[PDB]
Design a protein around this ligand. Structure first.
Ligand code: NA
Ligand code: NA
Lengths: 49, 27, 46, 29, 49, 30
C-alpha cells in the first residue's frame, strides 16, 4: 500500500523537477532578451543625443 | 541598431505537458 | 493512508494549477517583449 | 509606434497564493 | 512508517512552496523592467514626434 | 532623460535549478 503511494510521489517529484529546470530556462531566455533590448534602446538614445 | 525576439514557446508547452502528466500521479 | 493520499492529491492539484498559471504568465511576457522589440525595430528603420 | 505594457499581476498573485495554500496540505505528524 | 513518508512529503512541499515564490518574484521583476522599458520607449517616441 | 533598465533575476533562476536538485533528497527509498 505504501509502495503504490511512494511510487506515485516519486513520479510526480520527477515531473516537478523538470518543471523547475524548464521554468529557470524560460526565465533565463527572458532576462537575456529583456537586457539585450534595454541595451539596444540605450544605444539608440546615445546616438540620437 | 537591433532588438531581439524571444522564443520560450517550447518551455511554455513543456510546462502545460507536465501539468497534464501530473494526473497520472494522482491517487 | 487515506489521510496521506488525500493531502498528496490536494497538493498535486494545486501544483498543476501553478504550472499552467506560470506557463500563461510566461506567454504574456513573451508576447509583450516581442511586440516591444517590433516597436523598437520599426522606430529604428524610421 | 506604441510599446505595450504586460499585466501578469493576477498570475504573480495566484502563485503566491498557492504557496500559502499548500501549508494546508502539510501532513500533521 | 507513514511517519517518514509523511516527512519526505512535507520536505518536498516546503521546497515547492519556495520554488513558487521564487518564480512569482522573478516574474514580478521581469514585468517591472519590461513595463519600465515600454514607458522609456513610448516617451522617446513622443520626444521625437 | 531616457533610459532603459536592466533586469536581474539570476538568483531566482539559480534558486530554481538548485531547488530542483534538492528535491532529490525528498525522493522515497522503496
Ligand atoms: Na527538460
Ligand atoms: Na513532450
Amino acid at each position: 500500500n505504501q509502495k503504490q503511494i511512494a511510487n506515485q510521489f516519486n513520479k510526480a517529484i520527477s515531473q516537478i523537477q523538470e518543471s523547475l529546470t524548464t521554468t529557470s530556462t524560460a526565465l533565463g531566455k527572458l532576462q537575456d532578451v529583456v537586457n539585450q533590448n534595454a541595451q539596444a534602446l540605450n544605444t539608440l538614445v546615445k546616438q540620437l543625443s | 541598431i537591433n532588438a531581439s525576439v524571444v522564443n520560450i514557446q517550447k518551455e511554455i508547452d513543456r510546462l502545460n505537458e507536465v501539468a497534464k502528466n501530473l494526473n497520472e500521479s494522482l491517487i
